[PDB]
Design an enzyme around this catalytic site. Structure first.
Site, PDB file in Angstrom:
ATOM      1  N   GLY B  10      16.826  18.689  31.153  1.00 15.94           N
ATOM      2  CA  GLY B  10      16.382  18.757  32.535  1.00 15.94           C
ATOM      3  C   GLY B  10      17.450  18.333  33.528  1.00 15.94           C
ATOM      4  O   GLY B  10      17.401  18.680  34.720  1.00 15.94           O
ATOM      5  N   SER B  11      18.418  17.574  33.030  1.00 16.82           N
ATOM      6  CA  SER B  11      19.398  16.901  33.869  1.00 16.82           C
ATOM      7  C   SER B  11      20.473  17.864  34.347  1.00 16.82           C
ATOM      8  O   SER B  11      21.156  18.493  33.528  1.00 16.82           O
ATOM      9  CB  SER B  11      20.026  15.745  33.087  1.00 16.82           C
ATOM     10  OG  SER B  11      21.389  15.562  33.417  1.00 16.82           O
ATOM     11  N   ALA B  12      20.615  17.980  35.668  1.00 13.54           N
ATOM     12  CA  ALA B  12      21.603  18.898  36.250  1.00 13.54           C
ATOM     13  C   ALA B  12      23.024  18.634  35.746  1.00 13.54           C
ATOM     14  O   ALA B  12      23.724  19.564  35.350  1.00 13.54           O
ATOM     15  CB  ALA B  12      21.549  18.877  37.787  1.00 13.54           C
TER      16      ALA B  12
END
Lengths: 214, 214
Positions: B10-12
């Protein structure tokens, strides 16, 4: 032929570039900008830098304004292979890492904590203070058993980080309580060429602005 | 022999690295970290990364965790001279500039605006919203007359910026209203190798986390 640097001396990112220029013994054409009266907001400056910040480096057709891109650019351009920004990938990645730590963590946290107090008469926030302490604790760890912050030699990472860390002297953050940080601070002061002129002079101006506003 | 990447999808910043790996056709050993239950806070992880963040790239003796240092490291290591991170100083400085814009301005502003709402039930702040709009306006200017954000080719700057910009789809920031940004967004989606798997999949997980928290 010549390369322009738009700056103000009090600004930490500007001092990062002044330091890097001294370390490379470059002759930049320094162009003081009247930030105090919004010179950076006029069309002629926006043309050069639509983000209306300093520093802005102008090298013929190229305008770039992130201090941390400018300092690596100066080395890549004028001193490819310099220990200030080593080409070895692992060695370079460590310098880059420290640069991103500087902008995204240390200076960001300091900015968040300090500038509301200086420019918006905000009270000192304990939680934001603690976030700065944690950034310094990380720095102190990075420096455990190390002379410099990104390898055995002085690098653009030291110069950018010291411009940030020194700015803390204008506030109530006692960064020297971190023993490794204190050691490194002193080392860089005594080893970065032209430190007095490139950083200390401007730091003094910044303290001046801060006192005046407080 | 092999190189480890600690991440969550999920982490950009993690997606920036997944994108860069796909673009270089690398095989990283992906190691999912249980951030949700604080796996990153345990000593074994702190050993690797005292800042307890993702992603963390571990390459034998080297641990580095700033996504923007990792992506340039991957190119410097495996594909020196790649159009993804060109060696020409002026060309490289533009990519670096955009990377610093990403961390210090665009993603920082987005983070400031959005994460208080998601993780602290804060209300949406109009002023912080406007700061994000201004970051997007700057991006839209950078993209005027340009296919990509830092020169004529896809670069690690596009990949890092798109990982950030795409995350805005989880919020109420309509970034597609900026015509150049909208054009670029589409171009990168259709030209970054493995975009679906490296970015879109994770983006979906992020939207999931956001919905759940809201």
């Amino acid at each position: 032929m010549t390369i322009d640097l738009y700056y103000v001396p009090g600004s930490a990112p500007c001092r990062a570039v002044l330091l890097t220029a001294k370390a490379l013994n470059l002759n930049l054409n320094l162009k003081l900008v009247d930030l105090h009266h919004g010179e950076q907001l006029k069309p002629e400056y926006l043309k050069l830098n639509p983000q209306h910040t300093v520093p802005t480096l102008v090298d013929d057709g190229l305008s770039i304004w992130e201090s941390r891109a400018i300092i690596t650019y100066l080395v890549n351009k004028y001193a490819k292979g310099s220990s200030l920004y080593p080409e070895d990938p692992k060695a370079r990645a460590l310098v880059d890492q420290r640069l991103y730590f500087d902008i995204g963590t240390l200076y960001q946290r300091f900015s968040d904590y300090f500038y509301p107090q200086v420019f918006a008469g905000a009270p000192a926030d304990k939680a934001k203070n603690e976030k700065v302490q944690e950034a310094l604790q990380l720095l102190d760890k990075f420096l455990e058993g190390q002379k410099y912050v990104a390898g055995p030699n002085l690098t653009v990472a030291d110069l950018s980080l010291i411009a940030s860390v020194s700015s803390l002297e204008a506030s109530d953050i006692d960064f020297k309580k971190y023993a490794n940080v204190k050691r490194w601070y002193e080392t860089v002061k005594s080893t970065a060429p032209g430190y007095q002129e490139a950083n200390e002079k401007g730091l003094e101006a910044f303290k001046g602005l801060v006192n005046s506003m407080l």
